From Swiss-Prot:
Binds the CaM kinase domain of CASK. Forms a ternary complex with CASK and LIN7A, LIN7B or LIN7C. Competes with APBA1 that forms a similar complex with CASK and LIN7 proteins. The tripartite complex CASKIN1/CASK/LIN7(A/B/C) binds the cytoplasmic tail of NRXN1. Polymerizes, via the tandem SAM domains, to form long, 8 nM wide fibers, upon which other proteins can assemble. The chain holds residues 472 to 613 of 1431 of the full protein. It is found in: Cytoplasm. May link the scaffolding protein CASK to downstream intracellular effectors. The gene is CASKIN1. This is Caskin-1. Residues 1-64, 70-134 form the SAM domain.
Amino acid sequence: KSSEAVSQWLTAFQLQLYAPNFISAGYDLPTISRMTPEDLTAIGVTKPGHRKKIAAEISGLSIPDWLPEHKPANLAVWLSMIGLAQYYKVLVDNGYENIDFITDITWEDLQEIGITKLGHQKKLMLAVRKLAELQKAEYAKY
Ligand SMILES: [K+]
């Protein structure tokens, strides 16, 4: 249903030819909505004209909040909440079994352990920043 929704979003403004680009990188509309243009380049959308239509349509997206507004009890809950539970084992087996360890993580670290799909990295990285923001929100108090 996710890839379905990406296809449809792109066919709606005639750029479905890039569906493979987004989909095979594991992008989903939520994650797409937070793409920088650098991200766009990375998945092969390089033609300025198409970049710009997509960039405009990206800002045009209005889709419900999906990042957890609270730090969850454990890695399983968290991965589940952001729809990347298939990485539970690889993360745990590579020493990222608790949330705190993730918050330090970078894309280089994800590449090391095999989580390479750029869309998944983006989503994973977006989720990590939100935790980082939620932490600092405590120290302002404490
Ligand atoms: K699963």
